[PDB]
Design a protein around this ligand. Structure first.
Ligand SMILES: COC1=C(OC)C(=O)C(C/C=C(/C)CC/C=C(/C)CC/C=C(/C)CC/C=C(\C)CC/C=C(\C)CC/C=C(\C)CC/C=C(/C)CC/C=C(/C)CC/C=C(/C)CCC=C(C)C)=C(C)C1=O
Ligand SMILES: CCCCCCCCCCCCCCCCC[C@@H](O)O[C@H](CO[C@H](O)CCCCCCCCCCCCCCC)COP(=O)(O)OCC[N+](C)(C)C
Ligand SMILES: CCCCCCCC/C=C\CCCCCCCC(=O)OC[C@H](COP(=O)(O)OCCN)OC(=O)CCCCCCC/C=C\CCCCCCCC
Ligand SMILES: NC(=O)C1=CN([C@@H]2O[C@H](COP(=O)(O)OP(=O)(O)OC[C@H]3O[C@@H](n4cnc5c(N)ncnc54)[C@H](OP(=O)(O)O)[C@@H]3O)[C@@H](O)[C@H]2O)C=CC1
Ligand SMILES: CCCCCCCCCCC1=C(C)C(=O)C(OC)=C(OC)C1=O
Ligand code: SF4
Ligand code: SF4
Ligand code: SF4
Ligand SMILES: [Zn+2]
Lengths: 96, 156, 144, 63, 115, 386, 176, 29, 342, 208
């Protein structure tokens, strides 16, 4: 989800861009500004919400011991999905 | 034109001679010097690239700062750098020489040898492997290949 | 057995594509050994194996003559090897990426880049955080 | 035999401390307050000496 | 009583005599230091500096502290005579690359927060 | 008036950072005055701002020719202060890699000593063996020399499958390299002329001057900390202690070569006796839990978090722990105030006292003899200056 | 248990004395040393043809650092700061805040590679395998500034080396 | 449910390793 | 004041001075001292260079990490100038040559390039411009160097009215062409002097004084549109000055008078070298021309600097020109030369 | 208390306690305290005046024979009226034993040099003087050993800052290395690690 500033400088995923009157931009002359193009927030936004038939789901991030510490997520609320505090994967009980 | 062609060819010849005969000073400070010794060992054999140690600064082309530079040592390193005839090059090897490394916050350590001498190549690692140092040396060779001394003189 | 070694030398001359290929490899890599081709990069690097050589000479790469933008006929370096062949070439594994391809991910670079130091593509550090203290903006209208 | 001095102890000329960092500093001597986030009291037993806080600024490179 | 063990001197008079010996040694040594280290200062500059360093500690009234100061001065002189110090060490006494720091209240107020 | 000379720091035989102020009459050495501190980095003060784990890598960089031995000395000091015991397999791995480290150090010492004297070739032959040994280091830890492999509580990781076989393959061939080195040096009359009766030290003077290791055993003193004050599992391996008779450079060189052979013997015993089991102490308040446990169980996660942020507290007290490092007795005086950071850590390096004895050892000798004596003391200045 | 290294005696029979005299006058041990060097001359050298050939390395080798991702592309790092706390050189600088979607993520992740000692303690401390030491070791630069890595540089390194990094982790993780 | 697998010496131990000095006489009278 | 350009720190290497300076001509004699003084206090320095990068290496240690940035430029290309002055609040011009090359004459380096620099800096919004001229700049001077200097200062004032113009007189220092130039005249046996140097008065100024004056003029808000003359504290006859130079170097001084036409012939002869000439006709004219007296202009003391006399700093330049027999001779051993100070 | 816990040695503990009582009986003029730690290390706390008579005894007595001086260092404890703890570690090869001798001093009180007892002490005492400022009387050649020439202060004191007061760089105007007040692009980040819960009840102090 890259985006450009009024100066033409690419904005990073941290939302940091040099102002129009900032001298520090001179550091990029005759060179470039390193920017990572794979924005994690947009990438996790594309993952679908998993429908599971239990009130409590378990997530370890996939890969077993190659993931994150295994946590349990409550799915009682029907107004929102259950989000993993490590991975960002979303879960819900079937509704409608 | 013919003059630009001549000076470009002469630049090529001189750069080839200088990058093919690189003589570093016999100079090392700490653990990184051990990795440098391993670069001269038969497995890597830097001599096969034309790189030969010489003890005298008058007879050396390259300074490799291989180890921590202390405050007590800094004037001596500056002295032996100044006594190298030109052209001369400096390779900073290892975290200590690069920026202070493990001992960055010490009262008695210079935080990077670039505070004392200008540096052409920075080689990271603690220590860099002998192969990493060889890569840095070849990078310095490619940097010497790009010099345009005679062209710039001709354009003056 | 001198005739055997002479015939092996002539065989090495013939196995590099004739005299021109033999001299090309001799002047580009200072080595004229002929080995079994293991695979080829998308960038043009070729990989050869010969287990009859001792450990360290049993695997090698012939670098491509043209990478991303530059002419690498004479100027080559180890950073040109892409990661999969980097793993095979340093003997961190026994399987080339041809028989054991790496796991595909959508965020993995499709184009390997070498050491770009000294070029306009070089990395330039900068602070990645936002401005911390916000200054008061005076009103734009006269006060009397 | 001992020499029987009668003056208060002063070692400033021997410590190698710059003049500015002797006469312009103010030290605080105190028992540190318990961190309110925890109930343990083991960090409130000893006395601490600390110096006055001076200026910190942003490095133009790296911030 | 105060039951204190001396270092070299029992009272202030012997400590002052040792101070005078060290001062004479430094004063004699200064011209040799100027010649050997190839300094661009005058002999008067070096002696003025020596005097200044001695004057820095004029307020000390403890004979043990005076004895230790004389010990340190003798160490510095021995370092200088044997050319263990280099030119950078000798010139460090003069602070030739440090900008002059203001002392009056107003200039310090303008430049920053330090008292 | 004697001529005064700066021998180093920028000198081939000065080891990079040693400035030796020499007073000479012709080439006769009237006086040696070593000036050190050109590699003083303030390690002992820096350690006071680290946790014990954070302080561990500083020991790799003291005697950078013998890394895991320094790690072992520091780990033994901390384990003594913690009143805990490393598991047996960790102790066997420690002894095995300590003897590999002794091989590395003795190769460096002997070949650089020969290079100072003028025999340059054996350095190249033996540094390929050093290279192979470096691979064993990197395979076990990921680093060629500064492993940080040996930690208080045991070792960081278990041996990868297949490492023991490769170590055996190297060990069954190293003896022939030793034989070639001895064929080049031991009976050579030039080498003997350069080493025999040079730097002769008496046993009484060696003891009074604080010498240790070969600097003692070359003078006939029958002392080896592995025999007299064993640590880990050294009381379970058979080896001999080489003892000199003249106290000179030649006997010390012979002693070091024989110590290499005995190290090969010990390595063989270690390879054949390696037991199964865990490789760090089964106490998660000291050694971190396995990564799978950390990601599954609450106590393991808490202990991982605390050990990697605060570190373990060490009970208050002070210990002087010494080992028979390849360069002599290497010791740590460690003072714990009860917190998770060491209060004081004085490092005792054998090279300190050995180099302090250099002026005594050089009496009546020439310049080249002093070069040989510097080589025979086996000095590394990372541990001398700290 | 000990042995003597230099406590032997020579036999004084005329045969041994004459052999010693012949060694003294005809330089036999010097010829032995010459023979050893001649033997080494005809051995195959141990030199590898760098950079076309490389030295062997382990899956555990510690190289240039990288920041990793989950298979969905989400960053693994959740700004716990254990790597920053454990780092023996204080080479890591971390700043964090809640993201626009409420996630716990870093805004600053800097490693000073001229301060770093490449000990690998950061990757041991990391609970989610976010920061790693990769296999790359050929990343020398011409300026000091290029070795002060920010978060974008480390994420680019992860994206560039993940294929190798994942295989090395798969090879080694059962020992960790 | 597999067996414990660790780097260990082969059954019966490793083959004997030489360490002693070997400098043959190798000369005439 | 643009918060990122608000001074911070103690004024040392890691501090922030608040100055962003583009220094044209930074690879020469005065440029290294100016860059060192800017980097001492934590300024951001931009170095436009046309020479080989190997020839800029000595400027790298002069600033903390990130504080000295090197960029290529072309004196005949205004886009390069725009590129290197885009983000600066201070522009210093130290570009100059003491001889004419086949690509750049005196008018190119002293009129056209300063005018382009001033105009581009004015367009780009640079706040402060420092331009270096000569004390003896004159539209009717016998030296074309000084005529070009006068024309160039006129054009710089036309294109950047708020410029600060600084006119030094014969800077001496370790890398100078003044003290070293007169000390290198011994290689020819005698010392040729027009009229034996008896009709020439010189007022040379120390290099560090000039560099500190430029720094202080940057820091002085009143120095905006003024013209300064940087001269030393003493005035000497050329004969006495050269005799003092040879005495400090402990070389035999053999002065002889050479007529103006013959000296011009010698200068033209030396002008034919494709390398750096040993001397030129213009150099001959400038050496034998008296320094102007300009009391109405402010000087170094108006910027808080007491001028360093030559007698305290001649040895640091001329010790290198001594034989081994005289290397250790001390500074106060030479008996300073006579001065004609009004 | 099996595999995890370090084993005890009562025999060595008893032997060291008996020898400490022996030493205290022989030299009551100087010995202030004797201690045996639980990992079997013997410490003897003495008055400073007894540095030479005690060490000599431990070196020369037929039943001590502590011929080796392994190490000699100092510890700085600013809360004590006598700031500096002086520590001698001795090794007896005849009896295969080690002993530690401890004494104290302040900033202005000299300690007798022990070069006449152990020559190895020479450099060690220099290092102490270099790092802590403790003056040793009758030292043959006392001067800095580890610090730079002209260095001011004693870095190993607790009140000396970690980065010191001055740093070094090459200056081109003067063409030499110069020392200037230290400025850090990144300040060392102080960490507060101590847990507010007591770790070891066996070392709890009375609450005053
Ligand atoms: C600004 O610095 C300067 C330099 O920089 C280093 C110079 O080289 C330089 C040139 C001066 C020397 C390089 C010349 C040294 C050699 C002499 C010119 C010898 C001339 C006469 C010889 C032929 C000796 C025999 C005499 C006759 C037979 C003719 C000058 C003038 C100078 O001024
Ligand atoms: C006659 C006496 C006076 C003259 C003195 C000089 C003696 C003759 C000069 C010798 C010429 C030989 C040089 C040619 C060798 C070049 C080899 C080649 O490889 O160079 C390439 C290109 O070479 C250079 O571009 C120029 C080479 C030739 C110089 C240009 C022609 C000038 C000749 C004019 C001679 C006149 C002398 C002066 C007369 C007064 C760059 O490739 P390189 O990076 O290395 O290889 C990387 C290593 N890899 C392959 C393993 C990865
Ligand atoms: C045994 C091997 C050698 C045998 C002995 C003679 C070898 C001759 C080899 C000649 C190689 C070509 C030399 C090219 C480099 C010349 C020296 C040099 O690098 O100077 C570069 C210099 C840089 O000066 P500037 O750009 O103006 O700025 C300086 C201030 N910053 O540029 C020049 O001056 C180039 C001038 C050309 C010199 C003439 C060379 C011609 C060959 C002469 C050989 C003599 C043979 C008799
Ligand atoms: N020195 C003195 O006594 C006096 C000096 N001045 C003025 O001070 C300024 C600097 O003095 P100094 O430093 O001694 O002169 P230098 O020649 O020592 O420095 C010259 C600078 O100008 C640059 N330069 C020259 N010609 C060109 C060009 N055509 N295109 C681009 N850059 C060019 C050089 O770049 P490169 O290095 O690439 O050639 C170098 O950086 C000059 O303007 C001089 O007139 C004024 C009065 C007296
Ligand atoms: C001829 C064999 C190759 C020698 C390579 C030159 C080594 C330069 C480093 C100096 C040095 C030497 C000689 C050295 O021997 C040594 O060990 C004590 C060091 O400590 C790391 C050194 O730094
Ligand atoms: S960078 Fe690491 S290996 Fe190199 S000298 Fe410093 S501590 Fe030793
Ligand atoms: S490898 Fe070690 S020094 Fe480097 S960032 Fe990680 S923890 Fe810090
Ligand atoms: S990289 Fe790992 S240890 Fe470091 S802050 Fe992120 S999650 Fe925590
Ligand atoms: Zn999850």
């Amino acid at each position: 989800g890259v985006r450009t500033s009024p100066t033409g400088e690419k904005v990073t995923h941290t939302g940091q861009a040099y102002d129009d009157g900032d001298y520090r931009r001179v550091r990029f002359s005759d060179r470039q500004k390193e920017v990572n193009e794979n924005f994690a927030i947009d990438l996790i936004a594309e993952q679908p919400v998993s429908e599971v038939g239990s009130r409590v789901i378990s997530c370890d991030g996939g890969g077993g011991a190659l993931g994150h510490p295994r946590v349990y997520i409550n799915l009682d609320k029907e107004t929102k999905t259950g989000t993993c505090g490590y991975c960002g994967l979303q879960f819900r009980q079937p509704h409608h | 034109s013919r003059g630009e062609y001549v000076v470009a060819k002469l630049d090529d010849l001189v750069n080839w001679a200088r990058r093919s005969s690189l003589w570093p000073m016999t100079f090392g400070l700490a653990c990184c010097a051990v990795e440098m010794m391993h670069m001269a060992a038969p497995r890597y054999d830097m001599d096969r690239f034309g790189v030969v140690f010489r003890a005298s600064p008058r007879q050396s082309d390259v300074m490799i700062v291989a180890g921590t530079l202390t405050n007590k040592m800094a004037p001596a390193l500056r002295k032996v750098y100044d006594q190298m005839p030109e052209p001369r090059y400096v390779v900073s090897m290892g975290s200590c020489a690069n920026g202070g490394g493990y001992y960055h916050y010490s009262y008695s350590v210079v935080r990077g040898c670039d505070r004392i001498v200008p540096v052409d190549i920075y080689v990271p690692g603690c220590p860099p492997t002998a192969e990493a140092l060889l890569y840095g040396i070849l990078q310095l060779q490619r940097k010497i290949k790009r010099e345009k001394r005679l062209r710039i003189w001709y354009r003056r | 057995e001198l005739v055997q070694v002479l015939r092996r030398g002539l065989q090495q001359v013939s196995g590099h594509g004739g005299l021109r290929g033999y001299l090309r490899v001799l002047f580009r890599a200072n080595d004229v050994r002929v080995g079994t081709l293991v695979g080829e990069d998308k960038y043009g690097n070729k990989y050869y194996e010969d287990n009859k050589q001792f450990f360290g000479r049993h695997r090698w790469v012939i670098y491509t003559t043209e990478m991303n933008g530059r002419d690498t006929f004479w100027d080559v370096d180890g950073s040109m090897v892409p990661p999969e062949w980097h793993r095979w070439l340093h003997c961190m594994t026994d399987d080339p990426p041809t028989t054991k391809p790496p796991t595909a991910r959508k965020y993995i670079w499709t184009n390997h880049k070498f050491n770009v130091s000294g070029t306009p593509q070089q990395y330039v550090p900068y602070s990645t955080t936002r401005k911390k203290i916000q200054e008061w903006v005076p009103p734009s209208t006269p006060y009397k | 035999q001992l020499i029987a001095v009668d003056e208060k102890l002063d070692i400033t000329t021997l410590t190698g401390v710059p003049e500015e960092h002797i006469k312009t500093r103010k030290v605080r001597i105190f028992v540190p307050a318990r961190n309110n986030m925890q109930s343990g009291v083991n960090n409130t037993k000893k006395w601490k000496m600390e110096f006055d806080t001076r200026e910190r600024w942003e490095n133009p490179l790296m911030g | 009583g105060t039951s204190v063990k001396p270092i070299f001197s029992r009272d202030m008079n012997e400590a002052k005599r040792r101070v005078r010996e060290l001062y004479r040694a430094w004063y004699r040594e200064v011209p040799n230091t100027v010649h050997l280290f190839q300094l661009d200062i005058s002999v008067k500059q070096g002696r003025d500096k020596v005097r200044e360093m001695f004057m820095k500690n004029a307020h000390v009234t403890d004979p043990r502290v005076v004895d230790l100061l004389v010990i340190k001065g003798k160490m510095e002189l021995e370092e200088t005579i044997n050319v263990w110090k280099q030119r950078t060490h000798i010139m460090r006494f003069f602070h030739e690359t440090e900008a002059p720091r203001p002392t009056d209240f107003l200039s310090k107020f303008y430049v920053g927060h330090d008292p | 008036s004697n001529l005064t000379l700066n021998f180093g720091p920028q000198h081939p035989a000065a080891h990079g950072v040693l400035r030796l102020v020499m007073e000479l009459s012709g080439e006769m050495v009237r006086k040696c005055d070593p000036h050190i501190g050109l590699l003083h980095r303030g390690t002992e003060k820096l350690i006071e701002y680290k946790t014990y784990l954070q302080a561990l890598p500083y020991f790799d960089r003291l005697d950078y020719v013998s890394m895991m031995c320094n790690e072992q000395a520091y780990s033994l000091a901390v384990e003594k202060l913690l009143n805990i015991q490393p598991p047996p397999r960790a102790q066997w791995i420690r002894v095995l890699f300590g003897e590999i480290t002794r091989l590395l150090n003795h190769i460096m010492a002997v070949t650089t000593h020969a290079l100072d004297i003028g025999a340059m070739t054996p350095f190249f032959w033996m540094f390929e063996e050093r290279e192979k040994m470096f691979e064993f280091y990197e395979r076990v830890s990921g680093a060629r020399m500064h492993a940080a492999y040996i930690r208080p509580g045991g070792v960081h990781q278990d041996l990868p499958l297949g490492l023991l076989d490769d170590i055996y393959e190297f060990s069954k061939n190293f003896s022939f390299r030793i034989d070639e080195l001895e064929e080049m040096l031991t009976n050579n009359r030039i080498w003997r002329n350069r080493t025999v009766d040079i730097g002769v030290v008496t046993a009484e003077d060696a003891l009074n001057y604080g010498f240790s290791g070969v600097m003692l055993r070359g003078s006939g003193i029958q002392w080896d900390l592995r025999k007299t004050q064993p640590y880990d599992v050294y009381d379970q391996v058979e080896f001999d202690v080489p003892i000199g008779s003249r106290g000179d450079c030649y006997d010390r060189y012979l002693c070091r070569v024989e110590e290499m052979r005995q190290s090969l013997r010990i390595i063989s015993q270690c390879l054949n006796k390696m037991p199964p089991g865990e490789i760090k102490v089964d106490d998660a308040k000291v050694s971190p839990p396995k990564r799978a446990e950390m990601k599954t169980s609450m106590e393991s996660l808490i202990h991982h978090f605390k050990l990697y942020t605060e570190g373990y507290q060490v009970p208050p007290g002070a210990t002087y722990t010494a080992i028979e490092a390849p360069k002599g007795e290497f010791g740590v005086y460690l003072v714990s105030d009860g917190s998770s950071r060491p209060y004081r850590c004085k490092i005792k390096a054998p090279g300190f006292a050995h180099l302090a004895g250099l002026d005594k050892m050089s009496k009546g000798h020439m310049l080249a003899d002093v070069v040989a004596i510097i080589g025979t003391q086996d000095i590394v200045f990372g541990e001398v200056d700290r | 248990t000990y042995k003597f290294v230099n406590m032997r005696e020579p036999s004084m029979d005329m045969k041994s004395v004459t052999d010693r005299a012949a060694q003294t006058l005809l330089w036999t041990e010097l010829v032995r040393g010459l023979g050893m060097t001649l033997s080494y001359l005809f051995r195959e050298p141990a030199t590898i043809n760098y950079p076309f050939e490389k030295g062997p390395l382990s899956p555990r080798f510690r190289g240039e650092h990288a920041l990793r991702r989950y298979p969905s592309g989400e960053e693994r790092c959740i700004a716990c700061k254990l790597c920053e706390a454990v780092c023996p050189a204080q080479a890591i600088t971390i700043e964090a805040e809640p993201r626009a979607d409420g996630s716990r993520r870093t805004t600053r992740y800097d490693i000073d590679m001229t301060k770093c000692i490449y000990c690998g303690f950061c990757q041991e401390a990391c609970p989610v395998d976010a920061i790693v030491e990769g296999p790359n070791f050929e990343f020398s630069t011409e300026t000091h500034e290029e070795l002060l890595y920010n978060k974008e540089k480390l994420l680019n390194n992860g994206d560039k080396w993940e294929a190798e990094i994942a295989a090395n982790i798969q090879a080694d993780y059962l020992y960790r | 449910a597999s067996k414990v697998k660790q780097d260990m010496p082969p059954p019966g131990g490793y083959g004997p390793i030489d360490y002693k000095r070997n400098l043959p006489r190798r000369g005439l009278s | 004041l643009h918060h990122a350009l608000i001074p911070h720190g103690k004024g040392g290497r890691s501090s922030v001075s608040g100055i962003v300076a583009t220094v044209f001509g930074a690879t020469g004699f005065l440029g290294r001292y100016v860059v060192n003084h800017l980097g001492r206090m934590g300024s951001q320095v931009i170095v436009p260079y046309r020479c080989e990068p190997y020839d800029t290496m000595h400027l790298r240690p002069m600033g903390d990490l990130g504080q000295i940035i090197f960029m290529e430029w072309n004196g005949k290309d205004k886009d390069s100038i725009r590129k290197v002055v885009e983000h600066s609040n201070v522009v210093i011009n130290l570009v100059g040559r003491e001889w004419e090359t086949k690509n750049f004459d005196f008018e190119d380096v002293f009129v056209k390039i300063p005018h382009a620099i001033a105009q581009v800096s004015k367009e780009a919004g640079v706040e402060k411009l420092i331009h270096i001229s000569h004390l003896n700049a004159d539209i009717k001077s016998p030296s074309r160097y000084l005529r070009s200097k006068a024309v160039g200062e006129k054009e710089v004032r036309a294109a950047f009215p708020e410029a600060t113009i600084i006119k030094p007189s014969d800077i001496f220092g370790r890398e100078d062409r003044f003290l070293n130039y007169f000390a290198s005249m011994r290689w020819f046996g005698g010392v040729p002097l027009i009229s034996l140097g008896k009709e020439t008065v010189k007022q040379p100024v120390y290099i560090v004084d000039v560099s500190k004056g430029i720094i202080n003029a940057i820091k002085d808000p009143d120095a905006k549109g003024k013209t300064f003359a940087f001269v030393g504290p003493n005035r000497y006859l050329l004969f006495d000055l050269v005799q003092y130079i040879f005495a400090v170097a402990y070389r035999p001084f053999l002065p002889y008078p050479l007529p103006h036409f013959a000296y011009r012939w010698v200068g033209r002869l030396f002008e034919v070298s494709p390398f750096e000439p040993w001397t030129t006709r213009d150099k001959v004219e400038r050496v034998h021309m008296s320094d102007m007296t300009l009391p109405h202009l402010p000087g170094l003391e108006d910027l808080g600097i007491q001028a360093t006399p030559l007698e305290l700093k001649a040895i640091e330049v001329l010790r290198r020109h001594r034989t081994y027999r005289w290397l250790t001779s001390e500074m106060e051993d030479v008996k300073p030369a006579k001065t004609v100070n009004i | 208390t099996r595999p995890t816990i370090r084993p005890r040695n009562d025999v060595v503990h008893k032997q060291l306690s008996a020898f400490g009582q022996y030493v205290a009986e022989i030299l009551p003029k100087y010995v202030q305290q004797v201690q045996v730690s639980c990992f079997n290390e013997l410490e003897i706390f003495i008055h400073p005046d007894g540095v030479i008579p005690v060490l000599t005894f431990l070196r020369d007595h037929t039943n001590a024979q502590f011929k080796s001086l392994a190490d000699l260092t100092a510890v700085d404890v600013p809360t004590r009226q006598n700031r500096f703890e002086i520590v001698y570690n001795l090794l007896s090869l005849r009896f295969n034993s080690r002993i530690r001798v401890k004494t104290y001093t302040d900033e202005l009180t000299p300690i007798e040099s022990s070069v006449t007892v152990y020559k190895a002490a020479n450099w060690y005492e220099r290092e102490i003087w270099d790092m802590f400022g403790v003056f040793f009387a009758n030292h043959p050649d006392l001067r800095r050993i580890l610090t730079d020439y002209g260095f001011e202060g004693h870095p190993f004191r607790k009140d000396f800052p970690l980065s010191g007061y001055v740093e070094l760089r090459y200056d081109d105007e003067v063409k030499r290395v110069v020392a200037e007040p230290v400025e850090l692009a990144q300040e060392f980040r102080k960490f507060d690690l101590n847990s507010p819960w007591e770790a070891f009840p066996a070392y709890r102090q009375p609450p005053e």
